[PDB]
Design a protein around this ligand. Structure first.
Ligand SMILES: Cc1cc2c3c(c1C)C(C)(C)CC=[N+]3c1c([nH]c(=O)[nH]c1=O)N2C[C@H](O)[C@H](O)[C@H](O)COP(=O)(O)O
Ligand SMILES: Cc1cc2c3c(c1C)C(C)(C)CC=[N+]3c1c([nH]c(=O)[nH]c1=O)N2C[C@H](O)[C@H](O)[C@H](O)COP(=O)(O)O
Ligand SMILES: O=C(O)C#Cc1ccccc1
Ligand SMILES: O=C(O)C#Cc1ccccc1
Ligand SMILES: [K+]
Ligand SMILES: [K+]
Ligand SMILES: [K+]
Ligand SMILES: [K+]
Ligand SMILES: [Mn+2]
Ligand SMILES: [Mn+2]
Lengths: 500, 500
């Protein structure tokens, strides 16, 4: 099976790419596996595959860390992402995000039901598993539980059967047959949960699939529109119908090659302690436990020699940056264009801990709008900050065509030099805020409201007559012939490769 | 003579350090020398010494570019700065800035007058030089003139003789015997100029010395207090009285080993076209010429085989970042401490184009103040933004003790995660603004007023009971024994030197 359509094949692909370290000696899921993974993510090293995990029994489970993290080389920096999508390993961020957006104006390709698949190779009923006996990792030393769920896909369906959502949301083990996790507005798992709670008749049928098709985990991490079934979006993006099998204990459908599948229910009534967790913004607040959603597990099915993917998230750079930030930015780019705003590109700079998105403006189009900064900033912020795609983003930075928004250094330069604090910004206090940012949930103001800003780093003549500067840099402050002469004579004179 | 006390010795020191490229083939001062220098600064390469400059006659002049720019290696990143100060080449920024501040609570060591020195080896009178015939560089393709003065020291004295100021301010050639340059408030050359204009009797006696003692050019670039003669500050810092010679045509005193000395007057009445220039924030606005101060040159003296230092300034990283930003930050650190504010460290992040300063707070002291963010932000901004040392800085970022302000990535992390936009900031519109920032002089608001902000990245409990998080990073989210085990087994497992 292709790497983008089968997690097991994806692991092989990383091995082929010389982007895997297999560790075949015993590794402790109590902090050690996550510590190694953390170090990998902070140094852009090879992904670790822990084949000998202390506590693994009857095939449950190996761990793959850092499945969507960065490579060291500039040339194939995003190669692990590209391998989720059948793209060349040298693909640019622009190419990855365009691939992820491509299905937005295609007919869905609904999934194909097949009678069985590798995820049915082994099974454990209600009398045969205990989630406290599995080698679930403790990811950070102060976490409030063992976070089994950092890179699986929750599957829930609207009561009327018309929308089946796939998404990543964290969950930890509560007891032998329950998890607790984050289910918060405006996320689709929360929207669907609310539908079932209003109906009031039963708990939400649920499955959680780990080690799903890489293309599916990418869409699981992207805020595609309300009501859109991820399976058919992935089908369109990949050009192939995804093969799904029915769950044994409910009528949901899981990817045929899922490594591990939990089947059960998401309660419409019960909660349990959840967190704290070492989160995407780089912090844990020890002791900060709150009530989260509660899931009951009725059945486990799994592949022979099942592999659990794991995100050891926190400070730069991991899946919470490369996927959450980048995929939100992609959706925001499209949202702006569909609202007739002249945005060509969007990216969440890693330097901002993916709390900013830089929006590259087609300033020829802007000039034809005959508008002003105050009006344009307000328009952009109203579109983005009143939409789910803008949920995680607290600062939008508007930049002109000379800035490559995929280059943090250039975004920081433009922000620092072209946006006058205060005067060139509009604050938004009556929008939904993202409470997981420390300055929100642990800050001086309401955890759930406000704290957002549009920072205009367009210069005044970009609205009127056109850019009126040249950069004081090698590229723009010297003529072409001279630049080439300097380059051609560089090593000859005594001064200092692409792939590396 | 020691490298920190003699520019010629400093050049040798860079050669010894394997931090010099000597170019002995012809190089054009029309853009080529500056283009090579620009490339050096954007890639942290070795400093270039242009020994064969097209247009050099009768010993005027060679050029040294990038005299205060960065080295490639992390271990000796600031080695060129350290060589200005007799510090080891591996000195930290903290050590360099502490050296620059050390004289602030020492008795000055006034300069020693000596009858002659190398700067008197050659001379050209009023009939023998023409500044348009010298190989003055065109530094950026759109500059409004040939900027002879990018790394020399202006010398002016108060009318009452009690204060002699040394400072760097740019100047370009106007005609055969005049320069024009920037003389703007609140700079000391402007303050002294104003004194002479109020007296109304004569033009300001002036000298401009190029290739001065490296320790002297560092102080020339630092906002030491009003009324303080730089020569005696440098004397105290170095522990040695600087040797000065009298000018031939006036009674000012120049460093004995100056490479090149111009003697003349700064007009109290005349102006001439000045700029535009490729400036520290990374831009040139072509055609943006304004009237600047006008200097008349009466005499030139110079060393045999004189060397002109040159800053090819603009985008990161050059002397306008490493010296202007860092030395302002140093002075701001001291200013805050003298105003009883609990600041331990200050640095201007390069990522901010040195428009921000990050202030590291001793939060034990902060807690004993029993204050709030709004009160503390206001206090800090009133001290810094109403003082000359704060002139160039538009954003102050307050951070707690866990942040190393000398590490841009950590400053950006703290800013992005701990400071709620709006609520955690105080804007200052009734303070002097720095017009050279594009969003000031070429922006939407008054060029000379406002546009400043204090951004509080202290978390709420840092004011009360203490830090209440741990970082979700390798260092803080894993116990020491485990971290060491991971490190000790890192290469054994298959994963990836200080000097590099
Ligand atoms: C990549 C990724 C995405 C996580 C995530 C993580 C990763 C690695 C973890 C598991 C390591 C840390 C926490 N996660 C959460 C999460 N969204 C959320 O609502 N709760 C979460 O707990 N997300 C973001 C979520 O997947 C996106 O917001 C999707 O757009 C949600 O899908 P939806 O649009 O269908 O609701
Ligand atoms: C290192 C450095 C500092 C420049 C400088 C440059 C460099 C390389 C140039 C020459 C390349 C670009 C422009 N420069 C100017 C300048 N200050 C100023 O008032 N006008 C300027 O034109 N400065 C900053 C100035 O030296 C500091 O603000 C000092 O504190 C001024 O000394 P003072 O406190 O005695 O007034
Ligand atoms: O645990 C985290 O780091 C998290 C999260 C999250 C929640 C909602 C949307 C995006 C990320
Ligand atoms: O020409 C420049 O880049 C400049 C400047 C300057 C002026 C005043 C204070 C600091 C720097
Ligand atoms: K999704
Ligand atoms: K602006
Ligand atoms: K000075
Ligand atoms: K704060
Ligand atoms: Mn969805
Ligand atoms: Mn001074």
């Amino acid at each position: 099976q292709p790497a983008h359509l089968c997690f097991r094949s994806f692991v092989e692909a990383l091995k082929v790419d010389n982007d895997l370290v297999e560790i075949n000696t015993p590794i402790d899921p109590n902090l050690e596996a996550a510590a190694i993974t953390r170090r990998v993510c902070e140094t852009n090293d090879k992904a670790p595959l822990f084949n000998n995990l202390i506590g693994m029994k009857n095939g449950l489970f190996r761990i793959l860390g850092a499945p969507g993290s960065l490579r060291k080389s500039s040339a194939d920096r995003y190669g692990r992402l590209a391998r989720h999508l059948a793209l060349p390993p040298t693909a640019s961020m622009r190419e990855i995000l365009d691939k992820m957006l491509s299905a937005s104006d295609m007919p869905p390709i609904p999934p194909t039901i097949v009678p069985t698949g590798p995820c049915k190779e082994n099974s454990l009923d209600d009398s045969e598993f205990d989630l406290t006996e599995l080698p679930v990792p403790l990811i950070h030393k102060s976490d409030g539980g063992k976070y089994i769920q950092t890179y699986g896909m929750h599957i829930v369906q609207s009561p009327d059967g018309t929308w089946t959502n796939w998404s990543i949301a964290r969950a930890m083990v509560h007891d032998k047959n329950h998890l607790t996790g984050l289910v918060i507005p405006p996320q689709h798992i929360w929207q669907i949960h609310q539908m079932w709670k209003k109906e009031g008749r039963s708990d939400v049928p649920w499955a959680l699939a780990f080690g799903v098709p890489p293309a599916a985990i990418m869409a699981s991490s992207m805020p595609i529109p309300d009501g859109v079934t991820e399976a058919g979006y992935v089908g369109a993006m990949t050009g192939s119908s995804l093969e799904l099998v029915k769950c044994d204990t409910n009528d949901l459908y899981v990817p045929a090659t899922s490594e591990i599948v939990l089947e059960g229910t998401l309660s419409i009534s019960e909660t349990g302690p959840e967190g704290p967790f070492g989160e995407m913004h780089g912090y844990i607040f020890p002791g900060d436990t709150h009530l989260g959603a509660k899931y009951k597990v009725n059945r486990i099915t799994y592949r022979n020699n099942a592999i659990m993917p794991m995100s050891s998230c926190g400070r730069l750079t991991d899946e919470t940056h490369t996927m959450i930030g980048s995929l939100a930015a992609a959706e925001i780019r499209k949202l702006c264009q569909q609202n007739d705003l002249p945005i060509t590109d969007a990216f969440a700079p890693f330097e901002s801990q993916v709390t900013w998105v830089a929006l590259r403006v087609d300033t020829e189009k802007l000039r034809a709008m005959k508008t002003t900064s105050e009006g344009f900033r307000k328009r952009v912020g109203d579109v983005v900050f009143n939409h789910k795609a803008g949920y995680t983003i607290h600062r939008l930075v508007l930049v002109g065509d000379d800035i490559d928004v995929y280059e943090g250094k250039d975004v920081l330069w433009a922000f620092s030099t072209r946006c006058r604090p205060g005067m060139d910004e509009t604050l938004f206090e009556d929008v939904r805020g993202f409470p997981l940012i420390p300055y929100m949930g642990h800050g001086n103001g309401p955890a759930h409201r406000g704290g957002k800003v549009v920072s205009d780093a367009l210069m005044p003549t970009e609205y009127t007559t056109g850019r009126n500067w040249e950069a004081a840099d090698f590229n723009q402050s010297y003529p072409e012939d001279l630049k080439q002469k300097v380059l051609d004579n560089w090593t000859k004179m005594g001064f200092s490769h692409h792939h590396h």
